[PDB]
Amino acid sequence: MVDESDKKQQTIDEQSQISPEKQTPNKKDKKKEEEEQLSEEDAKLKTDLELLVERLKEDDSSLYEASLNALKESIKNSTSSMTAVPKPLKFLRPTYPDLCSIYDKWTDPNLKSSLADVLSILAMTYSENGKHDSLRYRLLSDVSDFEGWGHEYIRHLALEIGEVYNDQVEKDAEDETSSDGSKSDGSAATSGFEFSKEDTLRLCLDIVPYFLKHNGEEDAVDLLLEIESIDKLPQFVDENTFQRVCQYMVACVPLLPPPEDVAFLKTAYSIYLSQNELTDAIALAVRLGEEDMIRSVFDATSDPVMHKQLAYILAAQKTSFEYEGVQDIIGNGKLSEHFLYLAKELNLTGPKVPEDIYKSHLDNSKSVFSSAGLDSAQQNLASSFVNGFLNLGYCNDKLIVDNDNWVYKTKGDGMTSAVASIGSIYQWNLDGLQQLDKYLYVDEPEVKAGALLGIGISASGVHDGEVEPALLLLQDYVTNPDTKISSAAILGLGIAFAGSKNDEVLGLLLPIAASTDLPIETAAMASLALAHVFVGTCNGDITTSIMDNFLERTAIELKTDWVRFLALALGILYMGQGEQVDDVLETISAIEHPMTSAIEVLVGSCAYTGTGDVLLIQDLLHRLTPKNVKGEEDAEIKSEEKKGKSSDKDATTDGKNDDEEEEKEAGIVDELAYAVLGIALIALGEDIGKEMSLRHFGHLMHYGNEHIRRMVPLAMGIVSVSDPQMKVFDTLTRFSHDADLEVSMNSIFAMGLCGAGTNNARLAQLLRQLASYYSREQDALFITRLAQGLLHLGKGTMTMDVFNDAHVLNKVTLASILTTAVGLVSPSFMLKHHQLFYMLNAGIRPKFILALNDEGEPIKVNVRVGQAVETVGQAGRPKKITGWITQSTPVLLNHGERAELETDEY
Amino acid sequence: NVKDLKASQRVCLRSDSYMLHKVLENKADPLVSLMMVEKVPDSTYDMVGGLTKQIKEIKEVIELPVKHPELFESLGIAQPKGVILYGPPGTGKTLLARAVAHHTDCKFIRVSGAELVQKYIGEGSRMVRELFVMAREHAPSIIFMDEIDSIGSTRVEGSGGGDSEVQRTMLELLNQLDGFETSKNIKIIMATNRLDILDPALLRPGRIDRKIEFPPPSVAARAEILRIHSRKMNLTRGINLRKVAEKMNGCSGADVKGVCTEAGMYALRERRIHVTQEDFELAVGKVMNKNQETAISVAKLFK
Amino acid sequence: SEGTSADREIQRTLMELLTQMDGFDNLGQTKIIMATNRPDTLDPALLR
């Protein structure tokens, strides 16, 4: 440290720690006297650079501060940075660290502030040279180790980040602001940013998201594509690149409300497309929900290869996975045109092959019955629905149904729902139609109507490839003028096709849903069906639905139930979009009534989805307001008010649910809670309001996909035994279902205690019984999620009928609706060319460790489990493929996706 | 109200129903009860000096993750657990642990096998966790579990040290203490006469990672302890304390404090203010004679 | 007093006798006749 002169080269370094003699006196004097001596300075630049490098190792603040103190002055005091024009410009390389030594190494508040501004200007001017890039680089990849650079290099990088962010907030931009003093754009800093990005991508990760999003343009993202696609395999593997990308969309997913969010995720899709794996491509294309992006990946395998190859099989698998059936319709018919084989290809895309694999899983799952043996009165009705609820999905319980004794003892609305429950035994199955047919041609109209509902449920697993579509059966019934018959028919058609908006299905539903002049309560199903059809894909926000809602309000207000169902139907219709839904909020609000205000708060949730924090706060001010106005005064109306209050509560929960899914998974723990206080609250907000918030909570959890499933449903449940409306229990169980018999051991006991214990009304008893059977599926047959499963950010289309029903007080009429509850997840199996129905091995992981994702890419250690197991729910969801040791390579990466495994054995 | 009130805070009561009046202007703290009742000061490194190599070893491993645990976080290193100070008694093993406590800004909790410190639990097999938890409250702290490893004489056949039995309880806790409220700052400063009489499960892999031997004093180091003591006294000029350190040979840091005291009791008898160079001929001779009269038959400092 | 509490009850009462027997409390014309059935039970400060 101490000066020991020029005795050897080692002690020259020690000499310049206190006072440099080759950077301070000599150089300073030289610059301030002769200008022939500019030639001597130029040679001495190289020497000066070396002395910095050697003393980088030294970290002490005092011996960088004082040493380079008079050089820091010289910039404006003696040199003035223009006494020899080029020469000070190219000698700004040693002087730039001198400024940083007062910024970061020494902290003097007055100078630390002031010289930040100076650093920005000189960074820009020296990046013209392109040597400011090289200045950054020697510290980014390092040459020496010291604590100092670890705080310092960031400051250089921060100059760029500063200005670019400021141009959005303050419209004036450029160097007009004195907060940077550097121009925002122009060909002098733009080339600096590109070069900087290159070095920082290789070694770091830091400044790359700040730059793209701060420009605010998709253009920034499209520059990124170029650099990364080079890097895809030689620099590092495909996998490392995928983890590098998906996050541009994810940190900044929640962080894109509609117009930006779509434009950024377009680019990520394209990056994946460019790279080797098309498997990553399909996942992002589904995400966007655009028809256009789906087609391009499907075409990419199908069209170029003339031969059948792997390519046709692979295309069919990829589109099959979404059980919305949106991909299914689009992908069909290309197979027909090409014509290698119609028979294998068409079946494989359709959900017909999913019926067959279910038999293999079922061969394992068998049957254990537990259904209620109660008969007579309302207890007969309870038991007969319960049988269907335990045998959801493909199950064989034919003989019990064929005993027509208990069937005929149902009465009223009970008959309709009894036949509907029979259909859920043969849910997702071609056979089952036979049982329904018997009743349909005999007795009163009530059994005829219930048959049509059951056809709907059964037709879910078979409606593609022109193999017994739901359309075929149900068209005749729509024609028939009876209201019960027609209403039942169009409900079942919507369920079966789900998100598919095929020409025949859509166009049948197109002239209708436009009569509401005639007062019919069960014409809720008119719009309700059409709304269900629309979800799963981008929405036209159809003019048929918007018109009829307004017309209904004009005609009637007597049937409170009718207008409440209608309001929800609009909000569910708009799901699958958010850009266009900003427009329609205004359109609805054009005509103003207090009744119309009820509709608006619902539609606000969908428009504002993919952010909600302006939405959240809004849906809370609303809650306060009823109380606020009566509150204010001391210091026909019935229908309008009630619609008003209820809509808001539903809207609050809905807003939260879509928001929690798409974006960061940690926050989910709290979002359930935004409700616990919401509930305590409403249970608190009005006497009337308490009734609504109870029911909403259960579907909050199911939609939101809470991590915790043990504590919160059970605890809430106890309080709500005392409280009226036993429909609370039904909504809790749809969440609790999980992976069956993990969560659900506690659930059956807890729900069973209140139900068995208390009988004081057979009406109250009925709701409790149905909820219990729903929760469990024998021998872990299937799971239900609201989510797609293909994306865990995703949201289904079949589960939207579940979400609808919790907005109203319980009714016998509502029981008919509740039979439908579709939303199946398939169990993965390793496929072959002969369609092998067994998985070899898999790893399951309860909790992803990887803090290189939210989703957590499944690691490679895992816990090993056997063949032919259901894809586990929460606390099992990350799933890695074990097959690599046995000479097998997955073709279709599976992370705990719905998607069936496919392997190529070598 | 209840949010102006808290546990172990003295309140005034108006007693005819016991209706809370004021918070009191006092507060009890239980950790000072223990610390006082034992009684120990704190020190600096100018009251240890002369085993200046030792101060370097302990400042590395104890002081530097207190001031800056960040460095360790980056390296990725699980910071030191038990750190053994051991050597002949009185060589300022104890005064080093004190000296570090002032600098590190820790409570110097001297533990010593006492149960007089306690009157609310009264054993250390139910006060390992409570001891750790006071030190967590009044964080940071340096827990000086001084295990002498000779206490009792059925307890050394019985466990190799009954103190090491409690040491074993602490140290096992200590293994997952990497995060639970965010890492360590409650250090295990352990001490002993050697580690050949410590249980070999206290010296198992990864459990003890820095081990500090302390020698008897140098002749340069023994002069530096003498010089500290001379600032309390009033000498006569011309007395070299490098001369005194060479009259002595010591074998512990214990010997030179009693040389300094004996010269001022000899000057006390004299009835003159000054300390003279002749007092130090006799004094050096009184301790060196004392040191040999407990080792010719291995007689204790008691009957 | 590595036993029970009984044995420090013994100890409190024993210490009281010693200050009496010889102390700044002095005796007197008071005499101790101590009858015991075995004297090597005793504490040796009661053999004194």
Partner: protein
């Protein structure tokens, strides 16, 4: 000490006051307590210090 019974916590509470008043008592022209003990195995580590 036991200190698991009410009667020991009485013995102790007096000894804590001796020690505390002995700290108070220092740097005074008094001679700090003369005390005798029969044996050296009733001392506590803090008393003997």
């Amino acid at each position: 000490f036991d200190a698991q019974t009410g009667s020991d916590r009485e013995v102790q509470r007096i000894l804590i006051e001796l020690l505390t008043q002995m700290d108070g008592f220092d740097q005074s022209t008094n001679v700090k307590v003369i005390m005798a003990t029969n044996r050296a195995d009733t001392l506590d580590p803090a008393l003997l210090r």
